[PDB]
């Protein structure tokens, strides 16, 4: 697992860890999954935790998350709100804030720049995939 990967997984971990206590509870999984338009059942949430909870304590810590970590089009659809096939800074800034993240336009712009391959100022589907593959 590369250094950047552990750091990306750390970032993801932080997005679920609402209280910032080093643990992801079922409540946190549900809350986040509902903010993105999902509707998990208590049983499905219990099973997610169960399927990767090594020490059987009922919550996932960063190390367990790591093991777990160690579909694109659907994720693309969450970012591309207006459905035009392109993610713009404003759409990106929306998702980020939705994830509780508070960031500067400059930062949202740098993020767009990181994924933008052809340099049109937005992220299309192929560029979104490449960034994930």
């Amino acid at each position: 697992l590369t250094e950047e990967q552990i750091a990306e997984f750390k970032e993801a971990f932080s997005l679920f860890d609402k209280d910032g206590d080093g643990t992801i509870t079922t409540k946190e999984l549900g809350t986040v999954m509902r903010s993105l338009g999902q509707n998990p059942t208590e049983a499905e949430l219990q099973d997610m935790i169960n399927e990767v909870d090594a020490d059987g304590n009922g919550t996932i810590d960063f190390p367990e998350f790591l093991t777990m970590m160690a579909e694109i089009r659907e994720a693309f659809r969450v970012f591309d709100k207006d459905g035009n096939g392109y993610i713009s800074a404003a759409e990106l800034r929306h998702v980020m804030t939705n994830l509780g993240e508070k960031l500067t336009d400059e930062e949202v712009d740098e993020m767009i720049r990181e994924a933008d391959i052809d340099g049109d100022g937005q992220v299309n589907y192929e560029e979104f995939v490449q960034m994930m593959t």
């Binding site: 750091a7 750390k10 970032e11 993801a12 997005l15 994720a75 990181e114 994930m132």
Partner: peptide, 18 residues
């Protein structure tokens, strides 16, 4: 601020949430 890290982490999160 690491642009690629913050973006991929949020994409991973939505990818898992989905």
């Amino acid at each position: 601020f690491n642009a690629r890290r913050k973006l991929k982490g949020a994409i991973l999160t939505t990818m898992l949430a989905t």
